[PDB]
Swiss-Prot record, chain C:
<dbReference type="GO" id="GO:1901798">
    <property type="term" value="P:positive regulation of signal transduction by p53 class mediator"/>
</dbReference>
<dbReference type="GO" id="GO:0005654">
    <property type="term" value="C:nucleoplasm"/>
</dbReference>
<keyword id="KW-0687">Ribonucleoprotein</keyword>
<dbReference type="GO" id="GO:0005829">
    <property type="term" value="C:cytosol"/>
</dbReference>
<feature type="modified residue" description="N6-acetyllysine">
    <location>
        <position position="60"/>
    </location>
</feature>
UniProtKB/Swiss-Prot annotation, chain D:
<dbReference type="GO" id="GO:0070062">
    <property type="term" value="C:extracellular exosome"/>
</dbReference>
<dbReference type="GO" id="GO:0006915">
    <property type="term" value="P:apoptotic process"/>
</dbReference>
<keyword id="KW-0687">Ribonucleoprotein</keyword>
<dbReference type="GO" id="GO:0140078">
    <property type="term" value="F:class I DNA-(apurinic or apyrimidinic site) endonuclease activity"/>
</dbReference>
<dbReference type="GO" id="GO:0008017">
    <property type="term" value="F:microtubule binding"/>
</dbReference>
Swiss-Prot record, chain E:
<feature type="binding site">
    <location>
        <position position="20"/>
    </location>
    <ligand>
        <name>Zn(2+)</name>
    </ligand>
</feature>
<dbReference type="GO" id="GO:0005654">
    <property type="term" value="C:nucleoplasm"/>
</dbReference>
<feature type="binding site">
    <location>
        <position position="41"/>
    </location>
    <ligand>
        <name>Zn(2+)</name>
    </ligand>
</feature>
<dbReference type="GO" id="GO:0070062">
    <property type="term" value="C:extracellular exosome"/>
</dbReference>
<dbReference type="GO" id="GO:0005925">
    <property type="term" value="C:focal adhesion"/>
</dbReference>
UniProtKB/Swiss-Prot annotation, chain H:
<dbReference type="GO" id="GO:1990948">
    <property type="term" value="F:ubiquitin ligase inhibitor activity"/>
</dbReference>
<dbReference type="GO" id="GO:1901798">
    <property type="term" value="P:positive regulation of signal transduction by p53 class mediator"/>
</dbReference>
<dbReference type="GO" id="GO:0000028">
    <property type="term" value="P:ribosomal small subunit assembly"/>
</dbReference>
<feature type="cross-link" description="Glycyl lysine isopeptide (Lys-Gly) (interchain with G-Cter in SUMO2)">
    <location>
        <position position="93"/>
    </location>
</feature>
<dbReference type="GO" id="GO:0016020">
    <property type="term" value="C:membrane"/>
</dbReference>
Length: 145, 143, 104, 171, 55, 75, 189, 121, 72
RNA sequence: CCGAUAACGAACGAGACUCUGGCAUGCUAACUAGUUACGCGACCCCCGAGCGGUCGGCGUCCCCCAACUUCUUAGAGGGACAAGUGGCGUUCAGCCACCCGAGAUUGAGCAAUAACAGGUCUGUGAUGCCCUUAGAUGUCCGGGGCUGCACGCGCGCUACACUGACUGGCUCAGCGUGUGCCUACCCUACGCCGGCAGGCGCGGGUAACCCGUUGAACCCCAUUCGUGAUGGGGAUCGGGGAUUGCAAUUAUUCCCCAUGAACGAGGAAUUCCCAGUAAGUGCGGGUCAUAAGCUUGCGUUGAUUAAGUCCCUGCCCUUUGUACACACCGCC
């Protein structure tokens, strides 16, 4: 605690396919991963039995791969069902947490599916408009002009 | 020198009560302590691990202060300020099940009993426990 | 019975309630029943605020309306019977009277 | 109790009942010199008192019309039968009743009298009944299509403060 | 139409369930204290009900 | 005035730098420690409480948002 | 005896210039244990003269929307900054405050309506009350925009603002602005 | 594939066990009582689908009601959803189940902004 | 009340109760030669501040402010 | 208002008035408010206090079975009048300072003549005239629309952060509402289930009896963070779960998990405001089957500046000038 910088302290890490700032706290470093938020980080760290008050760069490989393994399949790790992102999938109806660019391509394929079935929400997405029924008369002029 | 809980600062008093509750650990800690938020309006889980012991100690202190407080009562104490994002803020109450489970754990240690009316209060031996801890923390803060 | 009754008096004004609360208790003392002291409940104040305009065009003037409701509680308790003894009401229009019993 | 509403709604319903009764008697007793209505309420029964100039006119043949209106109010607000009584009270100093003088003027103008002479006569009568002041305004399509308003006023007439409430009557 | 569509459309709640107790209008009603009266009619009759002005 | 790149963890040239002259001047705050030692500031607080426990820095204020320290008296 | 904030006796503090000693209220007749009072000092003209300047600093410090009721936080700020300046200097914080008020009071200013020569048409010397008020306002402004977007907290900014104003070092916002005002006034003589 | 199950199982998937597969709003919708309008529309599609020629799509049926949720038993029908002016025919694909009928009959045509007039001087 | 107004009420009540106790159960000499220090130290310790609030009006959000007006 | 005075005598407005708030240990009363005392108790000290301390624990209008209104309530009353002092003043009207006083200017409501082609015929079984009146401009039902977006404007809210954000602990309100003639629709305690959004049973309250002692927010105390578009910021957008209804899609609303976009304090211009005021801060009512970024009020924290001016915008009186009189947005 408050020692010199550890010798195996990389300043940034490589998680899945993305890089995270090891200078910041682990509870907030992995929030850099898309699909990972502060609550998700908090719960995976608490059930990872990892001290929260240490930075990401001072971890070791076993700890970080435990974190990765929990994140990839948190169903078996007592993470409650309702806490997840991709619950009750539209393709296969299986409860899953999404962690990376799988989120990006899944969002993309959901939008193109909405367009293909020609949903009103999908058509709004196609035209770049608001889909939640907000007022477009006066607001959001920046995104077009 | 008779010492009541009203004569010592309640903050470190409830902290010492939580510490005693931790070290005299017999609690019915639910399995969902590590995950859930403490309220609708709270936006993070509590930072400390054994927050449950602290909250149960606070509920004990409140039932010492006044009796008959139901679950909705406790959430009324444990309410908080919902910032509600871009809309103006408001007031939001506490978690019903968290308070209920704390209470159930409180009669798990038989320091809390229900009233003849609705709600629950402290038992005389729980009052004794609180008073002993108050006297000992008074001795600690004085000496 | 042996009867212990409760009488409430309420209206919009204060003067009529005062004169009723005076003449009734005076009649009771003349008719030797001991009287529980006159209890004035907190005044109801119905506040209603409304735009003065019937159009909505103008300088946004809101008119406010008040209806002060005053109510008094006086109890008649006697060793003897009450209702067979006292029957006269002496009630002006505008004031409401309701007579209840201890069991009520 | 559960059947009986609270005090507030009770006073509100009383005010609504009074306003509806007054408005109905206005629309119905317009020509009979209607002046005002007074209701005296007891839990045993209620008493309705109507102030009008022509009591002999508001009462029908052997009290036919007063019976008619008693049945009307009986069936309208749904009183228990025989719990409401209709008393007609002949007003004193009809020149002071703003409502009655307004109705007499309106009757005169609908008759076709000259509005100038009708206003002068009504004002003279009101001041002859004895008053510390009077003021009448006629507004509408006088003369041509353009709207004009003629106000005839004499004597003292305050406008402001509390005392205008219990010194000046408005119709 | 017949009985099955002339008044079949539900109005057991909402603005269309209510009308002014005086002028039968559906705008500016005051449902406070069960008044059920239009705003303008409330202005017209507030003396008669007894709501007077103090402040 | 672009970026401060404050140090989150101590290194050798700054650890001894903290050790050898910090308890010498009158004012000791996390603010001054961070600003004259180019460290993050949570690190500053941690170092200050460690030096407190070691006992070579005297506490006066200990406020939740504004903690002030002084060196121990000379004499 | 009074010992504002539990220490820092008020008797020893001395007012150097007779120019503002009728408007500084640090003396035992105006010394108070704690700078908070519903003193109704705004009710009348010149009632702020009897108001202690510690209270004036506390009232003046809470500004800018986020701070319009946050008075006790300002009080704790004043107490902490007094702690800090006593530690950095060793003397009575109140004497530092008094000297800072003395040196931050701009002696003359310019104001008029017509065609500006440089900024205002005439140069006018000021009353002592305006000196005190403007000195306090300048000090609070200097602390506020000293601590805006930096890790150095508000207490230290207030502390070193008062220390620099107590001596005069051109490192404080207050006397920098005062010198600008004096230059403007002398040019617009 | 709606929730991992195939279409044919969805055909014989009765309401009560299907409400779990539906989202929250649709589950509330089936939990509340279906009215005679929905049942009449279902009967009309069933009659048309059975009288539909083999290897050939059925005839079109129109309807004002667009709050009808799509059932897997209507996949491949010709339904005419009113747009406020006309009834717009729409295919029922095997992925449209958790969708309203009105989500595919747009109520307005898109906006192509012409030159603004005297306003916004 | 709130917190600080509550504090002021308590301290005022302490001062007033002490001077009443000194006026009644002992001589007014002690009463007056504590009342003097109480007066020329803090008048509010014995006399309440009559100000409470001010009624909001229908032309502005607060007691004296008004909603922002624009001309164009 | 005093005064002069071809005026005299009046009248409205203003003032006056009503409410409101501020002091009343003075009166009246108080089990739908309590205070004090006592007795039961519970617990700490019991070394020893023991008339030690707490209790929002229970009783003493359960009728003989304690007193009292300080607190609370609301009525009668009182109280402030430029009343006293000093000064200025024609020594008249009156003005300033000071004492004593709760208060030496508490805010509102009401509010004159004459008008405006200002607004409302979409409030009316208020209405003239005109239009339509069975393929109805009446009226009903179904659906859409009133939200639709290259852009402009206004009132607002959120914010740009360390005077902060998060996590926990401690801790203080007042206004006012609450079950329906039609009219179905109340405010809610407590217990259980669920993590939250909710649901499941038992009650209370038609009300100073219940919600409720309205355990509000801000604030206060400790934790982490550390100057980064960062733990600020939460718009967009996905999945899922709840309530209202007949219906939630162009998402009603609420909730969980994801996304952290502009924004680093804002030009030319401009709004409001002098004390419990601005501002922060929450809370009630109105709209409500579902509901507030609005509004009406309420309370909490709580200032800087000023006791002056006509410079800007105007307002009022006298004199003056006019070629204006639809009245300088004139006329020419
Ligand atoms: Mg007036
Ligand atoms: Mg964060």
């Amino acid at each position: 605690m408050s020692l010199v910088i550890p010798e195996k302290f990389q300043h940034i890490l490589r998680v899945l396919n993305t890089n995270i700032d090891g200078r910041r706290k682990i509870a907030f470093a992995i929030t850099a991963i898309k699909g990972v938020g502060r609550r998700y980080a908090h719960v995976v760290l608490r059930k990872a039995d990892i001290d929260l008050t240490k930075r990401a760069g001072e971890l070791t490989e076993d700890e970080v791969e435990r974190v990765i393994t929990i994140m990839q399949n948190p169903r078996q790790y007592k993470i409650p069902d309702w806490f997840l992102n991709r619950q009750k999938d539209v393709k296969d109806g299986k409860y899953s947490q999404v962690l990376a660019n799988g989120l990006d391509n899944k969002l993309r394929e959901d939008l193109e599916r909405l367009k293909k079935i020609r949903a009103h929400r999908g058509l709004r997405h196609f035209w770049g408009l608001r889909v939640r029924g907000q007022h477009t008369k006066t607001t959001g002029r920046r995104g077009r002009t | 020198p008779g010492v009541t809980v009203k004569d010592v600062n309640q903050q470190e008093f409830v902290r010492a009560l939580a510490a005693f509750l931790k070290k005299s650990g017999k609690l019915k800690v639910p399995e969902w302590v590590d995950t859930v938020k403490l309220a609708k309006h709270k936006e993070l889980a509590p930072y400390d691990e054994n927050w449950f012991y602290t909250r149960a100690a606070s509920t004990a202190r409140h039932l010492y202060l006044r009796g008959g407080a139901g679950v909705g009562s406790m959430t009324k104490i444990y309410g908080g300020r919902q910032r509600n994002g871009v809309m103006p803020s408001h007031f939001s109450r506490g978690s019903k099940s968290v308070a209920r489970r704390v209470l159930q754990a409180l009669e798990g240690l038989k320091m809390v009993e229900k009233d003849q009316d609705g709600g629950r209060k402290l038992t005389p031996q729980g009052q004794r426990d609180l008073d002993r801890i108050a006297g000992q923390v008074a001795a600690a803060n004085k000496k | 019975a042996i009867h212990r009754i409760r009488i409430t008096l309420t209206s919009r004004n204060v003067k009529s309630l005062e004169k009723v609360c005076a003449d009734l208790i005076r009649g009771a003392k003349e008719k030797n029943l001991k009287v529980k002291g006159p209890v004035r409940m907190p005044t109801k104040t119905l506040r209603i605020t409304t735009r003065k305009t019937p159009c909505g065009e103008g300088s946004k003037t809101w008119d406010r309306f008040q209806m002060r409701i005053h109510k008094r509680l006086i109890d008649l308790h006697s060793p003897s019977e009450i209702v067979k003894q006292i029957t006269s009401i002496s009630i002006e229009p505008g004031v409401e009277v309701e007579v209840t019993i201890a069991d009520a | 109790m559960a059947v009986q509403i609270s005090k507030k709604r009770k006073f509100v319903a009383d005010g609504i009942f009074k306003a509806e009764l007054n408005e109905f008697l206005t629309r119905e007793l317009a020509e009979d010199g209607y002046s005002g209505v007074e209701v005296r309420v007891t839990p045993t029964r209620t008493e309705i008192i109507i102030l009008a100039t022509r009591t002999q006119n508001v009462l029908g043949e052997k009290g036919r019309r007063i019976r008619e209106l008693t049945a009307v109010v009986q069936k309208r607000f749904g009183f228990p039968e025989g719990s409401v009584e209709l008393y007609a009270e002949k007003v004193a100093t009809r020149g002071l009743c703003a409502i009655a003088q307004a109705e007499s003027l309106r009757y005169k103008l609908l008759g076709g009298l000259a509005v100038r002479r009708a206003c002068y006569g009504v004002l003279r009568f009101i001041m002859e009944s004895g008053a510390k002041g009077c003021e009448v305004v006629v507004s509408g399509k006088l003369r041509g299509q353009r709207a004009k308003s003629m106000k005839f006023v004499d004597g003292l007439m305050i406008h402001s403060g509390d005392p205008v409430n219990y010194y000046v009557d408005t119709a | 139409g017949h009985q099955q569509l002339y008044w079949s459309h539900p109005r057991k709640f909402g603005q269309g369930s209510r009308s002014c107790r005086v002028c039968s209008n559906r705008h500016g009603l005051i449902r406070k204290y069960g008044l059920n009266m239009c705003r303008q009619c409330f202005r017209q009759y507030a003396k008669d009900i007894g709501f007077i002005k103090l402040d | 005035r672009d970026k401060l790149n404050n140090l989150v963890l101590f290194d050798k040239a700054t650890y001894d730098k903290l050790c050898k002259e910090v308890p010498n001047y009158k004012l000791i705050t996390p603010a001054v420690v961070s600003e004259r030692l180019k460290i993050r500031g949570s690190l500053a607080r941690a170092a200050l409480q460690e030096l407190l426990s070691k006992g070579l820095i005297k506490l006066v204020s200990k406020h939740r948002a504004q903690v002030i320290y002084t060196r121990n008296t000379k004499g | 005896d009074i010992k504002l904030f539990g220490k820092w006796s008020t008797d020893d503090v001395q007012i150097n210039d007779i120019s503002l000693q009728d408007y500084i209220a640090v003396k035992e007749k105006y010394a108070k244990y704690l700078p908070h009072s519903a003193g109704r000092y705004a009710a009348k003209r010149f009632r702020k003269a009897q108001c202690p300047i510690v209270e004036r600093l506390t009232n003046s410090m809470m500004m800018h929307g986020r701070n319009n009721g946050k008075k006790l936080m300002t009080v704790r700020i004043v107490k902490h900054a007094f702690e800090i300046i006593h530690l950095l200097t060793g003397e009575n914080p109140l004497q530092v405050l008094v000297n800072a008020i003395i040196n931050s009071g701009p002696r003359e200013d310019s104001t008029r309506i017509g065609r500006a020569g440089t900024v205002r048409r005439q140069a006018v010397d000021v009353s002592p009350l305006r000196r005190v008020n403007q000195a306090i306002w300048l000090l609070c402004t200097g602390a506020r925009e000293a601590a805006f977007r930096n890790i150095k907290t508000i207490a230290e900014c207030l502390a070193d603002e008062l220390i620099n104003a107590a001596k005069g070092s051109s490192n404080s916002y207050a006397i920098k602005k005062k010198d600008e005002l004096e230059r403007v006034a002398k040019s617009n003589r | 594939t709606y929730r991992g199950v195939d279409l044919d199982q969805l055909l014989d998937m009765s309401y009560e066990q299907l409400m779990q597969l539906y989202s929250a709003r649709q589950r509330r919708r089936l939990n509340r009582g279906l009215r005679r309008k929905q049942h009449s529309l279902l009967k009309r599609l069933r009659k048309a689908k059975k009288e539909a020629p083999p290897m050939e799509k059925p005839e079109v049926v129109k309807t004002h009601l667009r709050d009808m949720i799509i059932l897997p038993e209507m996949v491949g029908s010709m339904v005419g959803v009113y747009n406020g002016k006309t009834f717009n025919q729409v295919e029922i694909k095997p992925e449209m189940i958790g969708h309203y009928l009105g989500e595919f009959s747009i109520t307005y045509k898109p906006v192509k902004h012409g030159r603004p007039g005297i306003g916004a001087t | 009340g709130g917190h600080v107004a509550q504090i002021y009420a308590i301290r005022q009540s302490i001062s007033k109760a002490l001077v009443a106790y000194y006026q009644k159960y002992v001589d007014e000499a002690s009463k007056k030669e504590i009342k003097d220090i109480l007066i020329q130290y803090d008048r509010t310790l014995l006399v309440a501040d009559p100000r409470r609030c001010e009624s909001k009006k229908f032309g502005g959000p607060g007691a004296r402010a008004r909603y922002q007006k624009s001309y164009r």
